[PDB]
């Protein structure tokens, strides 16, 4: 704890990539957050939309 | 363009569309500028038997 602040600026650039990546299992409104499933559910102008 | 179709194939002439019309007979664009008209010809195309 000595450390604090260097470890914290790790801290928080982990933190934020976490973030990013888990922003890939989001569905936005979508069907489904999975983008190849987008494309296997629905025909071309439903999928794209 | 111009063809005779059944009356309910008429759905399979708009863009982006997929059935054995579209897919194997009159395939338009997904970007499509135009207009598609249809009209009832049972009074001119069909015969007895």
């Known amino acids: ?48 939309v | 363009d111009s063809f005779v179709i059944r009356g309910d194939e008429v759905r399979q002439i708009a863009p982006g569309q997929t059935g054995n019309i579209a897919d194997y007979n009159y395939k338009l664009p997904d970007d499509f500028t135009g207009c598609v008209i249809a009209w009832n010809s049972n009074n001119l195309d069909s015969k007895v038997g």
């Open chain 1, 1 to 48: 704890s000595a450390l604090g602040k260097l470890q914290d600026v790790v801290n928080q650039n982990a933190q934020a990539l976490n973030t990013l990546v888990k922003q890939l299992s989001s569905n936005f409104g979508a069907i489904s957050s999975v983008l190849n499933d987008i494309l296997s559910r629905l025909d071309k102008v439903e999928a794209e």
